[PDB]
Amino acid sequence: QVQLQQSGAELARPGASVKLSCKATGYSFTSYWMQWVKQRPGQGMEWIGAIYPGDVTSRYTQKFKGKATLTADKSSSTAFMQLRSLASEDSAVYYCARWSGYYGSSSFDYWGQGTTLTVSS
Amino acid sequence: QAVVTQESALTTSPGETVTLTCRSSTGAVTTSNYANWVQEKPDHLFTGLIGGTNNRVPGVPARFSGSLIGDKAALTITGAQTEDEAIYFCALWYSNHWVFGGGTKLTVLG
Amino acid sequence: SYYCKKGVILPIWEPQDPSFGDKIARATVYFVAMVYMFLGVSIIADRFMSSIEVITSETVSNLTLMALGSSAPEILLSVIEVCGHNFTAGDLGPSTIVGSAAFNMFIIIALCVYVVPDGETRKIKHLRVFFVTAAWSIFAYTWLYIILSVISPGVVEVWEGLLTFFFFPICVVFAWVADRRLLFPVSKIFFEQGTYQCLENCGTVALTIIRRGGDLTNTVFVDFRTEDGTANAGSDYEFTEGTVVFKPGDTQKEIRVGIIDDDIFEEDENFLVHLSNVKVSSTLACLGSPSTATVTIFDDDHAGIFTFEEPVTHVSESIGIMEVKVLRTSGARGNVIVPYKTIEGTARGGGEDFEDTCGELEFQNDEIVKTISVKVIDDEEYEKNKTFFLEIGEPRLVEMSEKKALLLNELGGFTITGKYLFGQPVFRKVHAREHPILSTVITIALTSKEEEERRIAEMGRPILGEHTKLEVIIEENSWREQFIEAITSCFDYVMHFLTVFWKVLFAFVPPTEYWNGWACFIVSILMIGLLTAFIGDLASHFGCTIGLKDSVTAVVFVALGTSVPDTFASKVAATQDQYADASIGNVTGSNAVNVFLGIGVAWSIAAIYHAANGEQFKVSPGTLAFSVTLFTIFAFINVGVLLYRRRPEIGGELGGPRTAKLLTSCLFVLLWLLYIFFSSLEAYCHI
Ligand SMILES: [Ca+2]
Ligand SMILES: [Ca+2]
Ligand SMILES: [Ca+2]
Ligand SMILES: [Ca+2]
Ligand SMILES: [Ca+2]
Ligand SMILES: [Ca+2]
């Protein structure tokens, strides 16, 4: 019974910062990678990065290196993504996806329902 | 940097077989690209179907199968039902970062 | 007569000559059982011919073997009847061979004329071969008359029996022959090389300064200094601005430049070294080409590229523990945990066939190979080769220096371990399922150059190589298809349920693919021999129950039933081919081998057996004499009409104009009806 409870919808102004929380339950949090995916309508999907909540090992793409910081809180079994210097192109839907750590298996086993982020004034 | 291309949309009928394509811009997808297939249902319900070009997620129905045909990866659904009307994305590892496709909005008549 | 002799297999139905109603009851049982056997023989002889097809895989030599394969019911029945009934000539065997010739020569050829589609003709291209073969088949029945009536009448001698048999190899050699042939200066100061290369871990790089020319008995003063290129002083190299002096009689000096080492991945960097202020103690000396060297720094701090040695591994099952090697190929820096696991395929794990294992092996610094211990468990039984899989996960660079834990931007809890590496305190990440005092831990919580450093240092991450998935294979249906094909449109249902007993029974015949068709060949010829043992009995007891003679029941019933394999072989070749050679030749080839093997072998065995007893082998000529002469007279009419259809008005032996097509077919059916009616009367002495 794997369920990834994605955080509620967020509204922020441009130039501000927002923090998103995928509260993973139903499995061993500290032995599974969590992957964050950005979806924009008409631009497909973009991989943001991955985090290993065990020892806080993180991966990111080059364009999302400074934009997003991945953090985990193993006490409350929640993984966090913090977006800084928000702009109009950051208005998207962000998903959290579970990864076992093995490339022979699916890297996107279970997904959250997605938080819609609106960046407008 | 590389771009993954798919069909915009590809219709079919229930009970018929269907093949979906996933083409890399740098050339032919090998087994080192680890082509993954994921599916979104309406209202943002994502599910992971196929792992490293062959491995199927437990609980995914047996009609979904992944393989390599030519210079491109393939998702084949043999006898799709109405439940398979969804959007299918393909991801390639590229040794540093997953690159997703545009999604084929497969639709089944009913 | 109404008295029935005991057969090879079937017992005599008793009492004999019971009534008139019981004769109708008994003969109906014998007739239906005989017709059901004829249905069975056609199924097994079809499979027997298909096995012969595979052994010999359209020549006369190939077609004479297929004509031999379909004539096994006639050949075996004559041999079984003689040997089964104590080597006495019986009427049933010889008559079904002569009676088969009439059915083959007239009825089969008449059907082959008609099956060719309207507007299409089939012509005998090779007419020289047709003349020789058709004469030999007709002579076979003439020669049968000679030994019974002309030479020592009423008796078959040993040489007569053998000479009948030895005409069969003449058929074989002629077939092989026909395919082959018938068918086809002042002192100057300069560097040795001008471009040096050293690793980052050497510590010092050796440059060399040379003075040549002028007078060597002098003193030269020169300064050297290191200036930044793509490598920076204080972080990548040690800055040096020493002075070099050349003694009189000395021409070379070695200068050393320090290289600062660390654990951070970097690209190839270089720096510039310059010389100037050339002076002599007490024009005389100046710098020349070259005076500046570009010294490269190869960086060895990549944390590894993790692969299995090879994709497929073959393992003896009776082995204690495997040692799969995981090779860290492209560098080594810092401890790197590499998760692994076992995935069971055909070789199901859980301890029954291997011990399931999974864990987190950890490489140390500058250690390029470790092993994965999975233990195969052997079993007593001899089974198929089983496979299971081994796969490593995504590695984790657990241990790093202080300043490298900023470039990698690790924000987890860190521990200060005792060890020192390149002169720096070395930290190691806290992993969950391990507990600290939590006072001990340190948590370690751009300018367009720093971000370059992070981007380059993220290329020294532990990654996975070519082979991350290794298959372990442990080392020590066509039968099913026949049974599925055996049991499976109303007309099709009638034929399916009629022959379902035979198809299931004959699905136990080995598939033709085994032993290159020979496994099917041995079993099929045994079953043909078994079902023509029953046919010989069923036809024998049918005749004597109603008073029918063995001559009559062989000509009308047994001859027609055993030529069903010959009819379909000729019919397919009539339609599917372009000529009439194969269709007509199967009729001619069948007729020859019926006499030469069916009567040649059976009468050779009987004549030799009686000769060993000093006794003659007596065959009554009268029954067979009129049959063979009636056949030859009717055969010349059949051969004459076939040659008459070669005119351009008709165009060929088979097919042709529809009005001539029926007349040729109806004439040949009329010849068969005339033959079996006249032969039946002569059997009963009605002339
Ligand atoms: Ca350096
Ligand atoms: Ca540097
Ligand atoms: Ca180094
Ligand atoms: Ca270095
Ligand atoms: Ca076993
Ligand atoms: Ca075994």
Residue C441 lies in a domain: yes
Is C481 annotated for ligand binding? no
Whether C441 and C332 map to the same domain: the answer is no
* Polymer length of chain A: 121
A101 closest CB neighbour out of C393, C411, C433: C393
**Please, what's the b/e burial string for C507-541 (b: 16 or more CB within 10 A of its CB; e: otherwise)?**
bebbbbeeeebebbbebbbebbebbbbbbbbbbbb
A60: closest chain B residue by CA: B97
CATH of the domain at B42: 2.60.40.10
CB-count burial class (<10 Å; 0-12, 13-18, 19+) for C214? middle
Distance CA B2, CA B64 (A): 27
Structural domains in chain B (count): 1
Q: Which residues of C touch A56 (CB under 8 A)?
A: 410-413, 429
Distance CA A96, CA A81 (A): 9
Number of H helices, E strands in chain B: 0, 10
Give all strands (DSSP E) within C104-219, no chain letters.
Answer: 121-122, 155-156, 187-191, 197-199, 204-212
Whether C467 and C498 map to the same domain: the answer is no
Distance CA C593, CA C599 (A): 9
Whether C466 and C583 map to the same domain: the answer is no
Whether C371 and C401 map to the same domain: the answer is no
Spatial CA neighbour of B100 closest among C295, C372, A47: A47
Whether C527 and C406 map to the same domain: the answer is no
Partnered with residue B46 across adjacent β-strands are B40
Whether C580 and C678 map to the same domain: the answer is yes
Distances (CA, A) of C240 to C255, C490, C646, C677: 10, 104, 112, 128
Residue C590 lies in a domain: yes
Distances (CA, A) of B32 to B68, C423, C464, C596, C665: 12, 39, 10, 70, 71
Q: Which residues of B touch A109 (CB under 8 A)?
A: 48, 57
Distance CA C227, CA C273 (A): 6
Partnered with residue C525 across adjacent β-strands are none
Distances (CA, A) of C224 to C257, C273, C407: 11, 7, 34
CATH of the domain at A12: 2.60.40.10
Asked if B93 lies within 8 A of A108 by C-beta distance, the reply is no
Instruction: Characterize the bridge pairing of strands B11-12 and A33-39.
Output: unpaired
Range of the domain at C359: 318-389+462-475
Query: Which tokens sit at C686?
Result: 């009605």
Q: Is the backbone of residue C208 left (phi > 0), alpha (psi -120 to 50) or beta?
A: beta
CATH of the domain at C285: 2.60.40.2030
Distance CA B50, CA B35 (A): 8
Q: Which residues of C touch B53 (CB under 8 A)?
A: none
Whether the CB of B70 is below 8 Å from some CB of chain C: the reply is: no
Check if the beta carbon of residue C96 is closer than 8 Å to that of residue C562: yes
Distance CA C325, CA C338 (A): 13
Q: Is the backbone of residue C571 left (phi > 0), alpha (psi -120 to 50) or beta?
A: alpha
Structural domains in chain A (count): 1
Whether C384 and C467 map to the same domain: the answer is yes
Whether the CB of B58 is below 8 Å from some CB of chain C: the reply is: no
Spatial CA neighbour of C49 closest among C567, C495, C501, C581: C567
Distance CA B97, CA B94 (A): 6
Distances (CA, A) of C200 to C295, C333, C526: 11, 13, 84
Helices C127-145 & C621-644 angle (0-180, nearest 10): 160
Residue C481 lies in a domain: no
Range of the domain at A111: 3-119
Q: What is the DSSP string of A51-114?
A: EETTTTEEEE-STTTTTEEEEEETTTTEEEEEE-S--GGG-EEEEEEEE-S-TTS-S--BB---
Give all strands (DSSP E) within C106-196, no chain letters.
Answer: 121-122, 155-156, 187-191
How many other CB atoms sit within 10 Å of the CB of residue B82?
9
Sheet hosting strand B64-69, strand order edge to edge:
B4-5, B18-24, B72-77, B64-69
Between the CA of C271 and the centroid of ligand 2 the distance, in Å, is 11
Whether the CB of A99 is below 8 Å from some CB of chain B: the reply is: no
Give all strands (DSSP E) within C19-111, no chain letters.
Answer: none
Spatial CA neighbour of C129 closest among C584, C574, C640: C584
Q: Which residues of B touch A5 (CB under 8 A)?
A: none
How many other CB atoms sit within 10 Å of the CB of residue C312?
10
Is C261 annotated for ligand binding? yes
Whether C561 and C547 map to the same domain: the answer is yes
The amino acid occupying position C306 is F
Which residue, chain included where needed, has tokens 């019926």? C594
Check if the beta carbon of residue C264 is closer than 8 Å to that of residue C407: yes
Distance CA B39, CA B48 (A): 6
Whether C533 and C618 map to the same domain: the answer is yes
Residue C309 lies in a domain: no
Range of the domain at B25: 4-108
- To the nearest 10°, report the CA torsion of C327, C330, C331, C337: -50
Distance CA C122, CA C132 (A): 20
Shortest alpha-carbon distance between residue B31 and chain C (Å): 9
Asked if C463 lies within 8 A of B32 by C-beta distance, the reply is no
Whether C518 and C617 map to the same domain: the answer is yes
Q: Which residues of B touch A105 (CB under 8 A)?
A: 51-52, 55, 57
Distance CA B96, CA C460 (A): 12
Whether C293 and C353 map to the same domain: the answer is no
Check if the beta carbon of residue C207 is closer than 8 Å to that of residue C229: no
Instruction: Characterize the bridge pairing of strands C469-475 and C424-429.
Output: unpaired
C467: closest chain B residue by CA: B32
Residue C562 lies in a domain: yes
Residues measured by CB to lie within 5 Å of ligand 3, the ion = C 200, 261, 301
Is C381 annotated for ligand binding? yes
Spatial CA neighbour of C163 closest among C591, C613, C599, C620: C599
Distance CA A16, CA C199 (A): 46
CATH of the domain at C566: 1.20.1420.30
Whether C423 and C332 map to the same domain: the answer is no
* Collapsed DSSP state (helix, strand, coil) of residue C250: coil
Distance CA B53, CA B66 (A): 6
DSSP C259: B
A103 closest CB neighbour out of B34, B89, B97: B34
Distance CA A37, CA A107 (A): 11
A47 closest CB neighbour out of B50, B52, B97: B97
Residue C38 lies in a domain: yes
Spatial CA neighbour of C211 closest among C203, C197, C221, C200: C221
Is C581 annotated for ligand binding? no
Query: Which tokens sit at C646?
Result: 């070669």
Distance CA C218, CA C114 (A): 122
Interface test with chain B among A34, A45, A46, by most B beta carbons within 10 Å:
A45
